[PDB]
Coordinates of C-alpha atoms and ligand atoms in Angstrom, one line a residue:
Chain A
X1 CA 112.9 49.7 165.0
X2 CA 116.1 48.6 166.5
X3 CA 116.4 45.1 164.8
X4 CA 118.0 45.2 161.4
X5 CA 118.3 42.2 159.0
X6 CA 119.6 41.4 155.5
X7 CA 117.5 38.6 153.9
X8 CA 119.1 36.9 150.9
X9 CA 117.2 34.8 148.3
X10 CA 118.6 32.9 145.3
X11 CA 117.1 33.9 142.0
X12 CA 115.8 30.4 141.5
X13 CA 113.6 30.9 144.5
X14 CA 111.5 33.3 142.5
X15 CA 110.9 30.9 139.6
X16 CA 108.5 28.6 141.4
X17 CA 108.1 25.0 140.1
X18 CA 109.6 26.1 136.8
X19 CA 113.4 26.5 136.3
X20 CA 113.1 30.0 134.9
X21 CA 111.3 33.3 135.2
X22 CA 109.3 35.0 138.0
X23 CA 106.3 33.3 139.6
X24 CA 104.2 36.2 140.8
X25 CA 102.6 33.9 143.4
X26 CA 106.0 33.1 144.9
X27 CA 106.8 36.8 144.9
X28 CA 103.5 37.7 146.7
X29 CA 104.2 35.1 149.3
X30 CA 107.6 36.5 149.9
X31 CA 106.2 40.0 150.1
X32 CA 103.8 39.0 152.9
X33 CA 106.6 37.5 155.0
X34 CA 108.6 40.7 154.6
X35 CA 105.5 42.7 155.6
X36 CA 105.3 40.7 158.9
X37 CA 108.8 42.0 159.6
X38 CA 108.1 45.6 158.7
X39 CA 104.9 45.6 160.7
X40 CA 107.0 44.5 163.6
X41 CA 109.5 47.4 163.3
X42 CA 112.2 45.2 161.9
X43 CA 114.3 47.0 159.3
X44 CA 114.8 44.9 156.2
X45 CA 117.4 44.8 153.4
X46 CA 117.0 42.3 150.7
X47 CA 119.5 40.7 148.2
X48 CA 118.3 38.5 145.3
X49 CA 120.3 36.3 143.0
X50 CA 119.9 36.0 139.3
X51 CA 119.8 32.3 138.6
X52 CA 116.2 32.3 137.5
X53 CA 117.2 34.3 134.4
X54 CA 120.9 33.5 133.9
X55 CA 130.8 31.1 124.0
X56 CA 129.7 33.4 126.9
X57 CA 132.8 34.1 129.0
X58 CA 132.8 34.3 132.8
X59 CA 133.0 38.1 133.1
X60 CA 130.1 38.6 130.6
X61 CA 128.1 36.0 132.3
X62 CA 128.5 37.6 135.6
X63 CA 127.5 41.1 134.3
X64 CA 124.4 39.5 132.7
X65 CA 123.7 37.9 136.1
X66 CA 124.0 41.3 137.8
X67 CA 121.4 42.7 135.4
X68 CA 119.1 39.8 136.2
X69 CA 119.4 40.6 139.9
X70 CA 118.1 44.1 139.1
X71 CA 115.2 42.7 137.1
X72 CA 114.3 40.6 140.2
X73 CA 114.7 43.5 142.5
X74 CA 112.3 45.6 140.5
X75 CA 109.8 42.8 140.3
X76 CA 110.1 42.4 144.1
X77 CA 109.6 46.1 144.6
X78 CA 106.4 45.9 142.7
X79 CA 105.2 43.0 144.8
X80 CA 106.0 44.8 148.1
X81 CA 104.5 48.1 147.1
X82 CA 101.4 46.3 145.8
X83 CA 100.7 45.4 149.5
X84 CA 101.6 48.9 150.7
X85 CA 105.2 48.5 151.8
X86 CA 107.4 51.5 151.0
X87 CA 110.4 50.0 149.1
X88 CA 113.6 51.4 147.6
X89 CA 116.0 49.6 145.1
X90 CA 119.7 50.4 145.2
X91 CA 122.0 49.0 142.6
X92 CA 125.8 48.6 142.8
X93 CA 125.9 49.6 139.2
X94 CA 124.3 53.0 138.4
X95 CA 121.1 52.5 136.3
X96 CA 119.4 55.8 137.2
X97 CA 116.2 55.7 135.2
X98 CA 115.3 52.3 136.8
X99 CA 116.5 52.4 140.4
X100 CA 118.7 54.3 142.9
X101 CA 122.5 53.7 143.1
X102 CA 123.9 52.2 146.3
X103 CA 124.7 55.1 148.5
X104 CA 125.5 54.4 152.2
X105 CA 124.0 57.5 153.8
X106 CA 120.8 57.1 151.7
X107 CA 120.4 53.3 152.5
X108 CA 120.7 54.0 156.2
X109 CA 118.2 56.8 156.0
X110 CA 115.8 54.6 154.1
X111 CA 116.0 51.9 156.7
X112 CA 115.6 54.3 159.6
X113 CA 112.4 55.5 158.0
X114 CA 111.0 52.0 157.7
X115 CA 111.5 51.4 154.0
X116 CA 112.5 48.0 152.7
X117 CA 115.7 48.3 150.7
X118 CA 116.5 45.9 147.9
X119 CA 120.1 45.7 146.8
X120 CA 120.7 44.8 143.1
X121 CA 123.8 44.0 141.0
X122 CA 125.5 42.5 144.0
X123 CA 128.8 44.2 144.8
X124 CA 129.0 45.4 141.2
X125 CA 132.0 43.1 140.6
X126 CA 132.1 39.7 138.9
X127 CA 133.5 36.7 140.6
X128 CA 131.9 37.4 143.9
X129 CA 129.0 35.2 144.7
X130 CA 125.5 36.5 145.6
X131 CA 126.1 35.1 149.1
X132 CA 129.3 37.3 149.4
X133 CA 127.4 40.4 148.0
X134 CA 124.6 39.8 150.5
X135 CA 127.1 39.4 153.4
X136 CA 128.9 42.6 152.4
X137 CA 125.7 44.5 152.3
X138 CA 124.5 43.1 155.6
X139 CA 127.7 44.3 157.3
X140 CA 127.6 47.7 155.5
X141 CA 124.2 48.5 156.9
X142 CA 125.0 47.3 160.4
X143 CA 122.7 44.2 160.3
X144 CA 122.1 42.1 163.4
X145 CA 122.2 39.1 161.2
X146 CA 122.0 37.8 157.6
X147 CA 119.4 35.2 156.8
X148 CA 120.0 33.0 153.8
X149 CA 116.6 31.8 152.8
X150 CA 116.9 28.4 151.1
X151 CA 114.6 25.5 150.0
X152 CA 115.9 23.5 152.9
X153 CA 115.1 23.7 156.7
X154 CA 118.7 24.6 157.6
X155 CA 122.3 23.3 157.4
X156 CA 122.9 19.6 157.3
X157 CA 126.1 17.5 157.9
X158 CA 125.6 16.0 154.5
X159 CA 123.1 16.7 151.7
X160 CA 119.6 15.9 153.0
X161 CA 118.4 14.6 149.6
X162 CA 121.0 11.7 149.5
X163 CA 121.8 10.2 151.7
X164 CA 118.5 10.5 153.6
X165 CA 120.4 9.9 156.9
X166 CA 121.7 13.5 156.9
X167 CA 121.3 15.4 160.1
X168 CA 120.4 19.1 160.8
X169 CA 122.9 21.1 162.7
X170 CA 121.2 23.8 164.8
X171 CA 124.4 25.7 165.4
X172 CA 128.0 25.7 164.2
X173 CA 131.1 27.9 164.0
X174 CA 132.6 29.9 161.2
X175 CA 135.4 27.3 161.2
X176 CA 133.0 24.4 161.0
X177 CA 131.7 26.0 157.8
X178 CA 135.1 26.9 156.4
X179 CA 136.8 23.6 157.0
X180 CA 134.1 21.1 156.4
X181 CA 132.4 19.0 153.7
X182 CA 129.3 21.2 154.6
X183 CA 128.6 24.2 152.4
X184 CA 126.7 27.0 154.0
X185 CA 128.1 29.7 151.8
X186 CA 131.3 29.9 149.7
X187 CA 134.5 30.4 151.7
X188 CA 134.8 34.1 150.8
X189 CA 131.3 34.9 152.2
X190 CA 132.0 32.9 155.4
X191 CA 135.3 34.6 155.8
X192 CA 133.8 38.1 155.4
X193 CA 131.0 37.2 157.9
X194 CA 133.6 35.7 160.3
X195 CA 135.9 38.7 160.3
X196 CA 133.0 41.1 161.0
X197 CA 131.3 38.7 163.5
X198 CA 128.1 38.6 161.4
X199 CA 125.8 35.8 162.6
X200 CA 124.5 33.7 159.6
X201 CA 121.0 32.2 159.8
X202 CA 120.0 29.5 157.2
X203 CA 116.3 28.7 157.0
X204 CA 113.4 28.0 154.8
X205 CA 111.7 31.1 153.3
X206 CA 108.3 29.7 152.7
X207 CA 107.3 28.6 156.2
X208 CA 104.8 31.3 157.2
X209 CA 105.9 33.3 160.1
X210 CA 109.3 31.7 160.2
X211 CA 111.4 34.9 159.5
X212 CA 109.5 36.8 162.1
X213 CA 110.1 34.0 164.7
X214 CA 113.8 33.8 163.9
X215 CA 114.4 37.6 164.1
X216 CA 112.0 38.7 166.8
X217 CA 112.0 35.6 169.0
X218 CA 115.1 33.6 168.1
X219 CA 112.7 30.7 167.5
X220 CA 111.2 28.9 164.5
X221 CA 113.2 26.4 162.4
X222 CA 116.7 27.4 161.4
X223 CA 120.5 26.7 161.7
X224 CA 122.9 29.4 162.8
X225 CA 126.6 29.9 162.1
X226 CA 128.5 32.1 164.5
Chain B
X1 CA 131.6 50.2 103.4
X2 CA 128.9 52.4 101.9
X3 CA 125.9 50.2 102.8
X4 CA 124.5 50.7 106.3
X5 CA 121.7 48.7 107.9
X6 CA 119.8 48.3 111.2
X7 CA 118.7 44.7 111.9
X8 CA 116.0 44.2 114.5
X9 CA 115.2 40.9 116.2
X10 CA 112.5 40.2 118.8
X11 CA 113.8 38.9 122.1
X12 CA 111.7 35.7 121.6
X13 CA 113.8 35.0 118.5
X14 CA 116.8 34.2 120.6
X15 CA 115.0 31.6 122.7
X16 CA 114.7 29.1 119.9
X17 CA 112.6 26.0 120.7
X18 CA 111.9 27.0 124.3
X19 CA 109.9 30.1 125.1
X20 CA 112.3 31.5 127.7
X21 CA 116.0 32.2 127.7
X22 CA 118.8 32.2 125.2
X23 CA 119.5 29.3 122.8
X24 CA 123.2 29.6 122.2
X25 CA 122.9 27.8 118.9
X26 CA 120.3 30.3 117.6
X27 CA 122.8 33.1 118.7
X28 CA 125.6 31.4 116.7
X29 CA 123.5 31.1 113.6
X30 CA 122.6 34.8 113.9
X31 CA 126.3 35.7 114.4
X32 CA 127.2 33.9 111.2
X33 CA 124.6 35.8 109.2
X34 CA 126.0 39.1 110.6
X35 CA 129.5 38.0 109.7
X36 CA 128.5 37.6 106.0
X37 CA 127.3 41.2 106.1
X38 CA 130.5 42.5 107.8
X39 CA 132.8 40.5 105.4
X40 CA 130.9 42.3 102.6
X41 CA 131.6 45.8 103.8
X42 CA 128.1 46.3 105.1
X43 CA 127.9 48.4 108.3
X44 CA 125.6 46.8 110.8
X45 CA 123.6 48.1 113.8
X46 CA 121.4 45.6 115.7
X47 CA 118.4 46.1 118.0
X48 CA 117.1 43.1 120.1
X49 CA 113.8 42.9 122.0
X50 CA 113.5 41.4 125.5
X51 CA 110.5 39.1 125.2
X52 CA 112.5 36.0 125.8
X53 CA 113.1 37.1 129.4
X54 CA 110.2 39.5 130.2
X55 CA 101.1 43.4 140.3
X56 CA 103.8 44.6 138.0
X57 CA 102.7 47.9 136.5
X58 CA 103.4 49.1 132.9
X59 CA 106.4 51.4 133.6
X60 CA 108.2 48.8 135.8
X61 CA 107.6 46.1 133.3
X62 CA 109.0 48.2 130.5
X63 CA 112.1 49.0 132.5
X64 CA 112.6 45.3 133.3
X65 CA 112.2 44.7 129.5
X66 CA 114.9 47.3 128.7
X67 CA 117.3 45.5 131.1
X68 CA 116.4 42.3 129.3
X69 CA 117.4 43.8 125.9
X70 CA 120.8 44.6 127.5
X71 CA 121.3 41.0 128.7
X72 CA 120.5 39.9 125.1
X73 CA 122.9 42.5 123.6
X74 CA 125.7 41.2 125.8
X75 CA 125.1 37.6 124.9
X76 CA 125.0 38.6 121.2
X77 CA 128.2 40.5 121.6
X78 CA 129.8 37.4 123.1
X79 CA 128.5 35.3 120.1
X80 CA 129.8 37.8 117.5
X81 CA 133.2 38.2 119.1
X82 CA 133.5 34.5 119.5
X83 CA 133.7 34.4 115.7
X84 CA 136.1 37.3 115.4
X85 CA 133.7 40.2 114.8
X86 CA 134.6 43.4 116.6
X87 CA 131.4 44.4 118.4
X88 CA 130.3 47.3 120.6
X89 CA 127.2 47.6 122.8
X90 CA 125.6 51.0 123.4
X91 CA 122.7 51.4 125.8
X92 CA 120.1 54.1 126.0
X93 CA 120.5 53.8 129.7
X94 CA 124.0 54.2 131.1
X95 CA 125.3 51.0 132.7
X96 CA 128.9 51.8 132.4
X97 CA 130.6 48.7 133.8
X98 CA 128.7 46.5 131.4
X99 CA 128.4 48.4 128.1
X100 CA 128.9 51.8 126.5
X101 CA 126.2 54.5 126.6
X102 CA 124.6 55.5 123.3
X103 CA 126.6 58.4 122.0
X104 CA 126.0 59.5 118.4
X105 CA 129.5 60.5 117.5
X106 CA 130.8 57.2 119.0
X107 CA 128.3 55.0 117.2
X108 CA 129.2 56.6 113.9
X109 CA 132.9 56.1 114.5
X110 CA 132.4 52.4 115.4
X111 CA 130.4 51.8 112.3
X112 CA 132.9 53.6 110.1
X113 CA 135.6 51.4 111.5
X114 CA 133.7 48.2 110.7
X115 CA 132.4 47.3 114.1
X116 CA 129.0 45.8 114.7
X117 CA 127.0 48.0 117.1
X118 CA 124.3 46.5 119.2
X119 CA 121.8 49.0 120.7
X120 CA 120.4 48.1 124.2
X121 CA 117.6 49.5 126.3
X122 CA 115.6 50.7 123.3
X123 CA 115.1 54.4 123.4
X124 CA 115.5 54.4 127.2
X125 CA 111.8 55.3 127.5
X126 CA 108.9 53.1 128.4
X127 CA 105.8 52.9 126.1
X128 CA 107.9 52.9 123.0
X129 CA 108.0 49.5 121.2
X130 CA 111.2 47.7 120.2
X131 CA 110.2 48.3 116.6
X132 CA 110.0 52.0 117.4
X133 CA 113.3 52.0 119.1
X134 CA 114.9 50.1 116.2
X135 CA 113.4 52.6 113.6
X136 CA 114.8 55.5 115.7
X137 CA 118.3 54.0 115.9
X138 CA 118.1 53.2 112.2
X139 CA 117.4 56.8 111.2
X140 CA 119.9 58.2 113.7
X141 CA 122.8 56.3 112.2
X142 CA 121.8 57.1 108.6
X143 CA 120.8 53.6 107.7
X144 CA 119.7 52.8 104.1
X145 CA 117.0 50.6 105.6
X146 CA 115.8 48.8 108.7
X147 CA 115.3 45.0 108.5
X148 CA 112.8 43.5 110.8
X149 CA 113.8 39.9 111.1
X150 CA 110.8 37.7 111.9
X151 CA 109.8 34.0 111.9
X152 CA 107.7 34.6 108.9
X153 CA 108.8 35.1 105.2
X154 CA 107.5 38.7 104.9
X155 CA 104.3 40.8 105.4
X156 CA 101.0 39.1 104.8
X157 CA 97.6 40.5 103.9
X158 CA 96.3 38.4 106.7
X159 CA 97.8 36.4 109.5
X160 CA 99.4 33.1 108.3
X161 CA 98.8 31.9 111.8
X162 CA 95.3 32.0 110.8
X163 CA 94.9 32.1 107.1
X164 CA 95.7 29.3 104.7
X165 CA 94.6 31.9 102.1
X166 CA 96.9 34.6 103.5
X167 CA 99.1 36.0 100.8
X168 CA 102.6 37.5 101.1
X169 CA 102.7 41.2 100.0
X170 CA 106.0 42.0 98.3
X171 CA 105.6 45.7 98.4
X172 CA 103.5 48.1 100.5
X173 CA 103.2 51.9 101.1
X174 CA 103.5 53.4 104.5
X175 CA 99.8 54.3 104.2
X176 CA 99.0 50.7 103.3
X177 CA 100.7 49.7 106.6
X178 CA 99.1 52.4 108.7
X179 CA 95.6 52.3 107.4
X180 CA 95.3 48.5 106.9
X181 CA 94.7 45.8 109.5
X182 CA 98.0 44.3 108.3
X183 CA 100.7 43.8 110.9
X184 CA 104.0 45.3 110.0
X185 CA 105.1 47.4 113.0
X186 CA 103.1 49.5 115.4
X187 CA 101.7 52.8 114.1
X188 CA 104.2 54.9 116.0
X189 CA 107.1 53.0 114.3
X190 CA 105.6 53.2 110.9
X191 CA 104.9 56.9 111.2
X192 CA 108.5 57.6 112.2
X193 CA 109.8 55.5 109.3
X194 CA 107.4 57.3 106.9
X195 CA 108.4 60.8 108.0
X196 CA 112.1 60.1 107.5
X197 CA 111.6 58.0 104.3
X198 CA 113.3 54.9 105.9
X199 CA 112.6 51.8 103.8
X200 CA 111.4 48.9 105.9
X201 CA 112.2 45.3 105.1
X202 CA 110.5 42.3 106.8
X203 CA 112.0 38.9 106.3
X204 CA 112.9 35.5 107.8
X205 CA 116.0 35.5 110.0
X206 CA 116.6 31.8 109.7
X207 CA 117.3 31.3 105.9
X208 CA 121.0 31.4 105.4
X209 CA 122.4 34.2 103.2
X210 CA 119.1 36.0 103.1
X211 CA 120.2 39.2 104.8
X212 CA 123.1 39.5 102.5
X213 CA 120.9 39.0 99.5
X214 CA 118.4 41.6 100.6
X215 CA 121.1 44.2 101.4
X216 CA 123.8 43.6 98.8
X217 CA 121.6 42.4 95.8
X218 CA 118.1 43.5 96.6
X219 CA 117.1 39.9 96.3
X220 CA 116.3 36.9 98.5
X221 CA 112.9 36.6 100.1
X222 CA 111.3 39.6 101.8
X223 CA 108.5 42.2 101.8
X224 CA 109.2 46.0 101.6
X225 CA 107.4 49.1 102.8
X226 CA 108.5 52.5 101.3
Ligands
GTP301 N1 114.8 55.2 139.4 C1 115.2 56.0 140.4 N2 114.4 56.4 141.4 C2 114.9 57.3 142.3 C3 116.1 57.8 142.3 N3 116.3 58.6 143.4 C4 115.1 58.6 144.1 N4 114.2 57.8 143.4 C5 112.9 57.5 143.8 O1 112.1 58.6 143.9 C6 111.2 58.5 145.0 C7 111.4 59.8 145.9 O2 112.8 59.8 146.3 P1 113.4 60.7 147.5 O3 113.1 62.1 147.1 O4 114.9 60.4 147.6 O5 112.5 60.3 148.8 P2 112.7 58.9 149.6 O6 113.3 57.8 148.7 O7 111.4 58.4 150.1 O8 113.7 59.3 150.7 P3 113.7 58.7 152.3 O9 112.5 59.3 153.0 O10 115.0 59.1 152.9 O11 113.5 57.2 152.3 C8 111.5 57.2 145.8 O12 110.7 56.2 145.3 C9 112.9 56.9 145.3 O13 113.2 55.5 145.3 C10 117.0 57.4 141.3 O14 118.1 57.8 141.2 N5 116.5 56.5 140.3
GTP302 N1 131.6 48.5 129.5 C1 132.1 49.5 128.9 N2 133.0 49.3 127.9 C2 133.5 50.4 127.3 C3 133.1 51.7 127.6 N3 133.8 52.6 126.8 C4 134.6 51.9 126.0 N4 134.4 50.5 126.3 C5 135.1 49.4 125.6 O1 136.5 49.4 125.7 C6 137.1 48.9 124.5 C7 138.0 50.0 124.0 O2 137.2 51.1 123.7 P1 137.7 52.5 123.0 O3 139.0 52.9 123.7 O4 136.7 53.6 123.0 O5 138.1 52.0 121.5 P2 137.0 51.4 120.5 O6 135.7 50.9 121.1 O7 137.7 50.3 119.7 O8 136.7 52.7 119.5 P3 136.6 52.7 117.9 O9 138.0 52.3 117.3 O10 136.2 54.0 117.5 O11 135.6 51.7 117.5 C8 135.9 48.6 123.5 O12 135.6 47.2 123.6 C9 134.8 49.4 124.1 O13 133.5 48.9 123.8 C10 132.2 51.9 128.6 O14 131.8 53.0 128.9 N5 131.7 50.8 129.3

């Protein structure tokens, strides 16, 4: 059981080829990766963004986004339970009919008993990015690391798309990320991780077995900030 | 102020051309129609569906749908307040950071003071349709009628999506709606309207001034059940 991880996905990751909605096939693929972790006695928390769903002001937009993250968390819970994984959803905003509220002592108990816990509604506050919410939750549950799953193999010195001469950095420091043209997460997220010495792994979610390799073996394909 | 109405939109109505999401322009058009009612001392409650946003089992799907109606209600609130209309959102499920909870004595007060009240999360219960939720809220607030705003001009003897010979029925009885194969609302909704003698009007959201004509003048284009 010992190993404990927080896996963060963007909402867009659930949409598939399309720009919006939930692709049940993407969801099912994600569920199987998480199952590989659970079956290996790795304890798993999950944070999902809302970008696949979300005149309109910043604060309102952010609250709508938080609701979207809960819709995604519920859809994910269904996908995981569908393949026999015991799953709990805890929201930073109380929505009692639909999911549990975030309660520290309950989250820890869930993880100790081998449930996957999905955190919705971020920190429950607008203006904080999904990355920051995920980093906060990772630290709160005593995670060994946070994995930011992205469409890309890892962290590059310049966008890989253009120019195509961009190079993958296997490892870098919190300061490399904070003071650099290279975005890993926003500054607030990086700072929070830095000040709690939370290692950040960036990798591609959809390489089969990759999460398991990163967590259990410190292998696979990834970049790490620490 | 005397006149009080509940206006119900499907979620899909907010998506406009696309089948997913929220078309801000459609929202603005809707806001302007509501404004004409408010400026004419008509008290307005609104219910919106979630179909523009929403392995997954029925109960989970319905809860996701309810969250979608709240996202829509917030967007709608933004659109109405953008044009100066005091607007309140009340949810059947408490989501306190984002909107108010449904509270009868509060809803009545809001309406008496000329606020538009948008009801989110339906009845807070799965298996009840948006039409049923809307009929419920309509009766609870003492509405003179419920208006089901649709893409079509009114109620047809047969589907216009099928029937170049399909004719618009100007008036129907509750029994006509219940017994017939004509689509007005689901049986549960019709039964609840019938048992509380709530008149039902079906009409086309899009045509400017139509809501005002229906409510203030008993004119415009529409079908009625009573
Ligand atoms: N929607 C919703 N579900 C809840 C809430 N509290 C508990 N549940 C669900 O009800 C089921 C039973 O809950 P519990 O009695 O706390 O048992 P448990 O979650 O398995 O507890 P652990 O064994 O410690 O992991 C679980 O699926 C919970 O996720 C809640 O406040 N809202
Ligand atoms: N998100 C959220 N907003 C609330 C809640 N309660 C009140 N508000 C909002 O805070 C603002 C002030 O609310 P109130 O002090 O109740 O005054 P009011 O809404 O104007 O009340 P009326 O004059 O009776 O219509 C309004 O925009 C309310 O919608 C709540 O529980 N959650």
